[PDB]
Swiss-Prot record, chains A, B, C, D:
Phenotype for R154A: 60 fold decrease in ATPase activity due to impaired ATP-binding. No polymerization
Effect upon mutating N136A: 60 fold decrease in ATPase activity due to impaired ATP hydrolysis. No effect on ATP-binding and polymerization
Subunit-structure text: Homomultimer. Polymerizes in presence of ATP, preferentially on DNA. ATP hydrolysis triggers polymers dissassembly. Interacts with DDE-recombinase A; this interaction stimulates the catalytic activity of the latter as well as the ATPase activity of MuB followed by its dissociation from DNA.
UniProt subcellular location: Host cytoplasm
Name listed for the protein in its UniProt record: ATP-dependent target DNA activator B
Keywords: ATP-binding, DNA integration, DNA replication, DNA-binding, Early protein, Host cytoplasm, Hydrolase, Magnesium, Metal-binding, Nucleotide-binding, Transposition, Viral DNA replication
Assigned protein family: Belongs to the AAA ATPase family.
Site (Involved in DNA binding): R85, K86
Length: 235, 235, 235, 235
């Protein structure tokens, strides 16, 4: 019956905003390597939504080249007049973004070739801007160890988040107006299982839509009805 | 002599609308795997008919590629200016649908290659929208098990409907104004045989057109005259 | 200090030999679909080792065609003079194997195209012999449903083994001369975890080589020392 | 404990031998159209095994052409010196088989093109021999209706067998030494379900191998244990 919150600031969100603003204002490269289902994509989307001079793209294996990634960057910077070449595209990206004190955000940096990430680091080094990587722990694990070693000298900042926190899901429950202590422990048990923010928000929206359709309050019984579903331990 | 109902809300329809709104507002992927003749196509059509920011396509083996599916999507989103390439088409689809909080509905997801469904999940993950699959039980059975395993982490919701319910055909009979208890049992016997909604609506419209042509009421005799046809147990 | 047994007859081995001799003497097709680590490969190898007029090949994705599979068959039947064509190869395979009352054994039948398995079933139907498939549960799950439906009429026999039995690991412990009841329960706990025969034989040979290097008897402590290794619950 | 019979003469076998010898000595074309699992393949194999001047091939969709079928015929007639052309191959087949008063047997004649079956009927008409077709009821159903109409004038004989008989399974039970009346009725119930000879011989060999492994007689309980398997009514 109250509003379902689309987002809440957490301890992990306040950490990743600190590292984000650090990589931007420092104008240096930071890696966010950690297991997904923790919210780094939506946190970076929230940062780009709140703050200007911030740019965030995604990288697919269908867009794993240098040219496709720079085309994504040209679409993100607001330039539909991107040349199909690699050279003058790169120099136009260098022209547009110089002096902006901007921030480039890279999601799924584990799908990168060495030439692609090398062109991105030489780009940001020739632009005096900040670069932020996302993905699993393989993003850092592809570097330990000699081809990204100068990049390992440029990579100074990383905040690695494997699993969530107690105050993390506590602030989430505060956003969703949850005060049951057994409910708190059950949400922590949800946070124990992987895909934590995903499975958590699934269970929360199931319980919320159930409590609105039945006209009631989300209780621990609606949490058991939601979390008992989704077939997580089914092989 | 009264109006033949084109649609009725059922328990299965109320379940699949719940899962549909869940996959949309959750902005995550849900699978509807189950044997056909249960009404999932017309229920999704009804949901798109009642609700805005909702998009539903179909997938044929003649349109089983990435490019044909994205062309279907571009036709569904109202963009006749779709480029024939795969790249700028995908980025235009990403531009148009971002911020819309929309819902993509996929019918017959059993005909999918791994690259096609991978491009769709990377699309919706780069669009912050909801994706709904339809088809038989092979849609989930193609995943159990490693190539869609990260998608099995994204696939959290599924409502599997094999056969219908008693209150299902009861609400259908209430839409068709049927109060015979033997008529109720005979409609349940229709629901026992597969292609349940198809064979059921066939028998209902035969009995209705028969009762209008003879100027009478649909009785159990018109139900036997309709259901005795269609040659279901003929080899 | 006694001899480590390379093989023991089990209840599952006696079942799969029954189904094997049934598919051979019946001269019809039988499917063995079940999760691996149960010993179906070594049981079929043991059957071919003990019995004549028995042939067993493997199928890789590198040999997933009709021609490569029939080349494997020609190598298995003892014919190095196999033509590189598909036709006269198939007719020579039909000539050599007719009247032999033989048995063809197929391992990893989940990697099959429809043309390959169709050529194998038309081969064995034109040879009056038995065909045995192996693999996971996807071997049968690729048929439920119309292209292998006549093959589903030819497939009459299947013995599906998901997990092991109590008398299974009891006979294994009897082969390895184990009489501890807590040791029996711990071997059953090994059998609970998947890759059951693989992980079991790994733990047994670790404990046996440890007891021979230390000059002792395999105890429950050597079982904990072996089974505590292998890093099964490590992510 | 007695010998499992590989074959028994039935009423259907005595009928199909009558039609077989009729098509041969008449030197004319006969069609055997009927649902499989009735034993027409093994009956024709038995006829070729007992009788000389008898030839039986199979036809696959991989060998659906004229040339592949005549190559099968040249392999069946004992001529490995078959030319790869269509002409001199056909004339050598006409030379070898003239004056022999032979019999050509065709299995799965439903996979035939019109040119293939036309070349076979012009072959046998230019050889003064007999031609026998096998397959489902579609073999005759592809002719009703003008392109095989002169062949419908040459096709004078057909014996269509859809399902088995009481004396059929009675003679089978006499071959398998079965004297239980409830056992007789249960074997008739096996004969009711399609794939009759296939499912029947499967159940018989399961009960026989079970009675030999347990050292007992095949009873009605072994028939229930065999026939209760095979998962026939499982979807
Ligand atoms: N503050 C928040 N409150 C609730 N859910 C959140 C929050 N931030 C992120 N999420 C969740 O995170 C999920 C996606 O992030 P995630 O999958 O962890 O990204 P990645 O795959 O890049 O690690 C979304 O389903 C969203 O519900
Ligand atoms: N509420 C309803 N009342 C009556 N019939 C329905 C209803 N919803 C769906 N149907 C029937 O469902 C049929 C088509 O759905 P279906 O074939 O089950 O889709 P799919 O093939 O994707 O499973 C239509 O013939 C329609 O008559
Ligand atoms: N009788 C037996 N005693 C001990 N181990 C066995 C026996 N039969 C099979 N195995 C084990 O089975 C393993 C391989 O079989 P498996 O991997 O299950 O085949 P598949 O992969 O085809 O299922 C081997 O490691 C072997 O040790
Ligand atoms: N006299 C017989 N006694 C027992 N079984 C028989 C006999 N004749 C044929 N069969 C059975 O018929 C089966 C194959 O024939 P079938 O499949 O009917 O041929 P088609 O597929 O061409 O119709 C075999 O499994 C064999 O066991």
């Amino acid at each position: 019956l109250p509003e379902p919150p689309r987002f809440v600031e957490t301890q992990t969100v306040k950490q990743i905003w600190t590292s984000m603003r650090f990589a931007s204002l420092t104008e240096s490269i930071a890696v966010v390597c950690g297991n997904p289902g923790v919210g780094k994509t939506e946190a970076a989307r929230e940062y780009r939504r709140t703050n200007n001079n911030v740019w965030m793209i995604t990288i697919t294996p269908s867009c794993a080249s240098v040219l496709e990634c720079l085309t994504e960057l040209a679409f993100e910077l607001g330039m539909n007049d991107a040349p199909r070449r690699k050279g003058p595209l790169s120099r136009a990206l260098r022209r547009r973004l110089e002096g902006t004190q901007g921030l480039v955000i890279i999601d799924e940096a584990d799908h990168l070739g060495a030439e692609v990430l090398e062109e991105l680091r030489l780009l940001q080094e020739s632009t005096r801007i900040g670069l932020v990587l996302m993905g699993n722990h393989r993003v850092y694990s592809n570097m330990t160890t000699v081809e990204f070693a100068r990049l390992f000298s440029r990579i100074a900042k990383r905040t690695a988040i494997n699993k969530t926190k107690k105050a993390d899901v506590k602030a989430i429950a505060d956003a969703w107006q949850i005060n049951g202590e057994k409910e708190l422990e059950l949400l922590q048990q949800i946070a124990q299982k992987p895909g934590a923010l995903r499975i958590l928000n699934h269970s929360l929206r199931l319980a919320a839509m159930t409590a609105h359709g039945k006209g009631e309050r989300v209780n621990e019984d609606y949490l058991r009805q939601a979390f008992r579903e989704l077939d997580l331990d089914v092989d």
